[PDB]
Amino acid sequence: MHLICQSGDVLSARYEIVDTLGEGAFGKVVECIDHKAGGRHVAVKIVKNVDRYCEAARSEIQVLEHLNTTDPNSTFRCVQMLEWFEHHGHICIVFELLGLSTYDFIKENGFLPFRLDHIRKMAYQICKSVNFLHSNKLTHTDLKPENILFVQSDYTEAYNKRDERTLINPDIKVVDFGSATYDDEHHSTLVSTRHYRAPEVILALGWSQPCDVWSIGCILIEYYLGFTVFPTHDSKEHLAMMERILGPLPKHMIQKTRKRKYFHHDRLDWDEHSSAGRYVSRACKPLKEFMLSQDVEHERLFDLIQKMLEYDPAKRITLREALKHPFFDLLK
Numbered sequence: 256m257h258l259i260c261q262s263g264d265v266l267s268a269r270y271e272i273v274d275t276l277g278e279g280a281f282g283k284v285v286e287c288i289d290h291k292a293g294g295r296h297v298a299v300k301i302v303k304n305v306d307r308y309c310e311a312a313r314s315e316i317q318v319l320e321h322l323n324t325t326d327p328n329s330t331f332r333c334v335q336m337l338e339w340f341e342h343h344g345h346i347c348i349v350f351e352l353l354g355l356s357t358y359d360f361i362k363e364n365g366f367l368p369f370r371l372d373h374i375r376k377m378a379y380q381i382c383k384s385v386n387f388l389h390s391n392k393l394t395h396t397d398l399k400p401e402n403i404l405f406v407q408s409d410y411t412e413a414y415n416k417r418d419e420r421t422l423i424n425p426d427i428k429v430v431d432f433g434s435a436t437y438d439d440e441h442h443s444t445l446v447s448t449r450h451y452r453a454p455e456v457i458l459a460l461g462w463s464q465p466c467d468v469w470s471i472g473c474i475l476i477e478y479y480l481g482f483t484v485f486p487t488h489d490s491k492e493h494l495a496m497m498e499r500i501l502g503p504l505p506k507h508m509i510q511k512t513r514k515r516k517y518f519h520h521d522r523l524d525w526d527e528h529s530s531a532g533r534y535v536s537r538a539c540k541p542l543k544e545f546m547l548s549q550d551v552e553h554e555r556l557f558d559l560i561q562k563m564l565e566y567d568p569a570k571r572i573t574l575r576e577a578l579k580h581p582f583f584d585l586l587k
């Protein structure tokens with residue numbers, strides 16, 4: 256990868272690398288001048304020449320071809336692919352250029368949270384975008400702040416606690432369709448590492464579009480706080496955190512699951528006095544205690560978040576319903 260993505264490199268006799276925009280598991284995204292499109296700047300996703308990742312890239316290209324034909328005006332804010340090609344055996348996907356991810360923005364802003372008015376706008380766009388995927392028999396599966404990109408991330412700075420950066424325009428798009436799965440496709444029952452895994456994913460109960468809703472609830476809490484309420488990679492710890500924040504797992508889900516490794520009799524097999532246990536007790540608390548204000552717009556936000564973090568994926572709010580929530584009435 257190091258060998259093919261340096262500034263000044265030309266890809267496909269067309270795209271001149273001017274900068275690296277980011278790095279992920281899949282490889283790297285670079286900013287290029289498109290010399291056959293009048294010098295337009297584009298993003299180019301450079302994928303690792305590794306089976307797993309090439310496969311995911313071919314899949315993302317098929318999804319994006321479908322989405323971009325279905326929504327040619329990008330009314331629903333999914334990243335627009337321009338074309339793709341191969342370069343020294345690596346799959347390269349060309350995208351309209353976007354700005355900094357929401358994750359990166361929070362990081363470069365000292366983990367300061369977004370202002371509620373910006374959260375409302377961003378939440379609405381993310382809901383409408385992902386609802387579009389849901390309407391086309393797709394599940395994203397990997398929604399997280401790192402996969403939500405600002406269209407343009409210019410900001411202003413002012414003293415508040417501390418100095419803060421505030422977006423001038425908080426418009427976003429949804430990116431990374433390398434994990435997106437169609438309804439009639441084989442669903443990975445092993446879901447791999449994810450920022451925010453839904454309980455039905457952890458418990459191998461089956462997953463579909465509701466698992467996106469769960470992730471979006473988690474995104475919204477992270478936007479409001481500046482940090483995730485589930486600071487863990489471990490699946491049992493994650494369940495332990497869920498119980499602290501959201502209450503006990505429903506009996507009916509515990510009864511159904513084959514993941515008996517997490518359970519002992521009817522209850523989570525969790526030692527509250529272990530290292531991980533003590534940390535969970537410190538780091539997690541009931542959802543609504545995370546509120547920074549009791550003001551009604553905060554209550555509106557937290558009501559939506561709680562609905563998105565409903566354990567049972569059948570009962571969980573759909574995006575179509577979330578779009579009609581009171582939190583969004585100010586945008587009407």
Ligand SMILES: CCOC(=O)c1c(/C(C#N)=C\N)c2ccc(Cl)c(Cl)c2n1C
Nearest residue numbers: 276277278279284298350353401430431
């Ligand atoms: C995990 C880091 O990925 C990115 O840095 C990233 C990514 C990806 C992917 N795939 C995910 N965050 C981008 C997708 C489309 C566009 Cl237009 C841009 Cl600019 C993208 N960037 C910068």
